Point group: D2
Chain length 424, copies 4
């Protein structure tokens, strides 16, 4: 029934998934023509495959197309798209922001589109070279941050559709009040009622159904640390409300935080998402296990996601051996999607700071060192030292030669310095 | 006459500069109200001071605001905005392109705007912390790439204004055919006539005059390697035309390339620009000196720029001693603005490939190694390990506390893991 | 004191204005360099002057630059930038939306920037032709819709700054829950607490202070028709809460709507805004007078604003005589800014539907009818029939001639069909 | 061969079409995964059908999605996307420009996207209302302006792809130098060689091939009025070159302009496009007939396009009877696509200028006039007087109700003033 509305959806894709809406609602709200969303289809089906086939799927947050490309080239199988990074350095207000949903709601889907188009060029380049791809596929699924939905269920509906149009494979929504949204590891977090987040999630699924894509939905809870709640209207929340403490001047209720409300919320959200994620204060395998065991008593086999956050001081928290085994252990507990949210931001900022300091100190010696490290990384599959090829100069040369029946006088690669100075 | 129209311009700013237009043209084409472009003013004037006062001003191409921010944090005094990088990873078509002016003409100025807004937030953050700045200024001047002007002189005029509005300090224009534009170190370059590139330069100056800003103009010539030319109409170009070769199927003339047509074109361009740049095939200090000496014979003291290009294989061309002295030696010749065009692209792509490979193979050990290197770099001025502060969380906490008379329940830093674990 | 932080603010600009923050906060949050926002300064000051000197300033909602330009050419002295119209046909998601804050938060300021750049070209064209301007100024102040501020106080702060950078003269904010925002004339509105809307207004003022511009702030209340409220935490709202009815499933409180809670909120908002605006269900002069009288009792001389809404069926509500005098009466009560929100949308859609229907029916005859109507309007100051001049072709010719010392072979106007066929 | 690479192409679609590239080139340049461009396919296929089954397809230039929507509602079957209008009031530099390819190369396709998304919304609304559609389809094909391709063949290739991504059905390219592009009815036009324009056209076709869509390509020639030429390298152009006049200071050759070079260029372009278009200085049926006949002699049955330009002063050129039959006569000669380029601009500007003038004079009487005209137009299928429904408020209410299983408290239509006052 829903399978006939989402024809690319694989067998069993919606096992255990509940929807507030009917299949007739979907048809009534689809409009009258079939529009295909190819990259979203492929990405969602490949993600679904990967999380059921791998020990675990691990990703890094990409703030640019080029970043994503190198992740796939290095052999990673998924890309994470961080709202935090979007805020910091890649949003549609062209500003640097903290992670508080301050940027315009279109910014995340615009970055998803950029990432897919860079992966597309990479694919075109290798296809045109005629020797096979250097990766399994350039179209690694993107799991993308929709934050708190940017307001109400209609806002969640809209950003879900925008991510699908951009070609995202999975999207995550958290039970925070959008107007007070924070980074998971910042203070000042405000939860919305269990029912209200279930609305966001159903809105996301209605968006996917109407677009006709089996897009994955990740439900996130921020209840491990949050001590505020907008309303106690939901009886599932009331046991955690500290009534003696009274409301804040904003009218927020105050709540008991920790693993317990995370477990209750996750169990309530489970039927309305494909993966469940709980934010934590520390990289704590024991806590990760307790959460997974409690969810799995209610919902055996439910797939989980885990943020390996740069907001944790890793070696302050853990010894080298536990750090080394961390993701493998999490995978065996059922955390099949694991991501370093701010990997791109830290890599970009650290790397350019060190380059710039070296350059300041020793000028071209500092740059030659980077280039020599680039040459040495070629044995490991790095290609970008030859930057003209990397970005598609050779592909466009071939476009021009096809347009002109081989006759163009103005092709790029042949008399280039890349060709003359960058041979084996 | 032009000083009155550009109130911020410093003394001697326009010495030796000629213009095709008059001061009356400017008043006529400028509208009836005064609109200020404060970052463009501050930047141009600061770039002007720097290139005169320092031995040389060296820069790195920035593809994002965060990159520019660390460049300035590290002590660099200027930012280069590369069109190549705009094309690769930061354009308004959301596409990856080779360096051929394929992206929309607005993309460069949009990135200049991003960079200035990031620097703005950095300055806001430190200002609010109230212990003074960690740098001389966050507003390091931006020297930006306008490629071949993106078409005719009106296109050159428009991208110059856009860059002024975005807050660039200086903008470069090159004597290639915009519809066949290439990276200087690609083949297939086609030159335009000398006169035509002087129209582009004059378009750019008229834009700055009409905006009322003392924005710098950098004239680039691609004559060292280019073997094609659109038209032989300009007698100054005719001695380099290979009239024995005949025109190409497109109607292009074939020309004799090298240092000689570069010198001739430079000397012709010098009155219509502030700095002069010749693209080279190899990083060749002897060639650079020969160019500088020829230009300085006609135009003593003319400021020059130099592309320390990643499109060169540095260790293949040079020994370690020469690499080490390279920029210092260039500066002594008058190359006061020197820049590594693709620094940002190479840093970003190398750094992520290696992190991604480490992560695939060793998961969190590879990331914890990065974090540890970040902590180690703090002794030398790195701050970004503490990511919440870096992007302005403390600043926005301060804005909220002001709005609410100190009462907000939902400030972010106090109960953050950043405060607890860093 | 605050006048030093905002050098262009005229004498008396901030009489009666209270601020939650201090002058030191502003200096602390401003950054270290001086950046000028020239069109924002000019627009704010000119708007401030107009609303104190004119019987009333009336405007229409522009959904494009060309629209704005003809408003100014026609002799209107202000421009209204409608969020409804942004949603409908001019936003940064490139979608058609109903008026429910569904579009990205940057869209209105982006439209502000479009309007001001069109006006700038208008002014460049006429400056270059050398015979003076055909209007008092092309830079008619823009009063722009910031809706419910797109979230909490920091979002209000950010959209205010964005409108300032775009050159808006004034910005309005309303006491609705951003996440459930509606057009004032739709059902299902949810109010925020009086105090929370004061937080938004204060955010807006901190934004202007930090930018250093005397931008006008219009406080809007939607309490005439809104029957829902997020929280009863503010004692000021409690007299209007229906505690018998219970909360909805979302947890909203239900409230008793109408003029009374509008008056209470207006009086509370007054010290934190420059103009006050109450949405109404019907175009009613008597209710307008009641509101004005009550506000002026608490705050004598307070400037007010009034939405002459297309969401009203005008002839159903009012006779021709009342329609005719309607804005003049509002002016004498203190409604010094008055605006038809959806003016641009209705003229654009009606116009093109009728042209398209004529075209289907009669092809070129329907277009020629429009063209002759254009020629006839020239006697009343219309110019756009000569579309090449209108958009700046002669100005860019003059730029090319300046660049080429008069010698360019490729100027546009001399051999154009416009020069030959429109004499 | 090319039919398997473009699966949606109907039988005979590429009859007579030549390509410089091979089917193997397409496969090499296409990437390894199939990406679908649904609106581009449906658009192209419908346009192809319409131009073979209608006497002619007539369209108007839309500068906004709302304008396009009313054109489809009024019963027009295609939409024209004008670059001139993008320049004027709808581009990605947020500026007013003359028609000289000054705006960034992405602006046209961004507008194509807006137009198709508005049409999509109109379709969603009617589908949700369950009474069937009020039009044959909402997805009227868009014929879009690619100007001179914005540079070289690679720029043409890219703008073609972008238009296909935005859902355009057909795209037009002209044989002008992109760096000196003008409106066909401005002076200062510079042509490129016949060969160079053929490269642009093949670029466009390779783009469509690579995207896997049967997108229509319209070749435009500007040779009727152009007196300049970049290069005489192409022997096909040399008979029109006035060698005795010499070159201009820019290096341009000087050419004899008129019907003759247009005929030679069209005949050379024919195999590389689906429709041919000649810009003209006047709406001249005799000249139209002469061009059609000369083209049909070399290529029988070639479909043609004609610009019914507002740059012509219609009644100055023609009597009412010729105006009335103009399009029908063109249609019988083989001009199967006809378009009024600046219809959206002149309607938007005339309409707002007049509304604003009346508003200045008479305030709400002038708006009530518009609102009453709108009510009166409802008998002929106008609907936007009920603006809340028109932009999708009813549809989003239905979305909210589905999400919340009938329970939302905050739906908009029921308690709206539209429901109460526009019965
Ligand atoms: Na996030
Ligand atoms: Na927000
Ligand atoms: Na460049
Ligand atoms: Na180009
Ligand atoms: Na509004
Ligand atoms: Na919203
Ligand atoms: Na055009
Ligand atoms: Na151009
Ligand atoms: Na001849």
């Amino acid at each position: 029934d829903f399978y006939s509305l989402i024809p690319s959806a694989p067998k069993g894709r919606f096992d255990g998934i509940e929807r507030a809406h009917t299949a007739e609602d979907v048809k009534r709200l689809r409009g009258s023509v079939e529009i295909k969303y190819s990259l979203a289809e492929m990405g969602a089906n490949r993600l679904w495959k990967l999380i059921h086939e791998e020990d675990f799927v691990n990703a890094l947050g990409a703030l640019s197309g080029n970043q994503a490309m190198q992740m796939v080239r290095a052999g990673l199988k998924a890309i994470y798209l961080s709202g935090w990074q979007v805020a910091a350095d890649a949003n549609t207000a062209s500003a640097m922001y903290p992670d508080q949903s301050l940027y315009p709601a279109n910014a995340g889907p615009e970055l998803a589109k950029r990432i897919n188009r860079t992966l597309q060029r990479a694919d075109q380049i290798e296809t045109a070279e005629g020797k096979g791809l250097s990766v399994d596929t350039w179209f690694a699924p993107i799991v993308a941050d929709a934050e708190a939905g940017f307001g109400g269920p209609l806002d969640a509906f809209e950003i879900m559709k925008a991510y699908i149009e951009a070609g995202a494979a999975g999207v995550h929504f958290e039970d925070q009040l959008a107007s007070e949204k924070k980074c998971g590891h910042l203070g000042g977090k405000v939860l919305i009622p269990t029912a209200a987040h279930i609305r966001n999630l159903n809105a996301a699924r209605l968006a996917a159904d109407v677009m006709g894509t089996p897009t994955l939905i990740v439900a996130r809870t921020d209840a491990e640390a949050a001590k505020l709640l907008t309303s106690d209207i939901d009886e599932r929340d009331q046991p955690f409300v500290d009534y003696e403490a009274g409301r804040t001047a904003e009218g927020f209720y105050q709540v008991k935080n920790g693993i317990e409300p995370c477990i209750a919320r996750a169990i309530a959200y489970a039927p309305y998402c494909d993966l469940i994620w709980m934010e934590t204060s520390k990289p704590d395998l024991a806590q990760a296990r307790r959460f997974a065991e409690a969810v799995h008593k209610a919902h055996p086999g439910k797939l989980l996601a885990y943020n390996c956050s740069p907001s944790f001081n890793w070696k302050k928290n853990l010894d080298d051996a536990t750090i080394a085994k961390f993701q493998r252990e999490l995978g065996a507990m059922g955390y099949k999607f694991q991501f370093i949210t701010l990997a791109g931001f830290h890599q970009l900022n650290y790397g350019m700071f060190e380059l710039a300091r070296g350059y300041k100190d020793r000028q071209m010696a500092a740059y030659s060192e980077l280039q020599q490290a680039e040459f040495a990384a070629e044995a490991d599959g790095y290609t970008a030292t030859k930057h003209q090829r990397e970005v598609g100069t050779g592909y466009f040369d071939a476009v021009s030669l096809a347009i002109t029946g081989g006759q163009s006088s103005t092709t790029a690669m042949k008399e280039s310095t890349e060709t003359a100075q960058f041979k084996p």
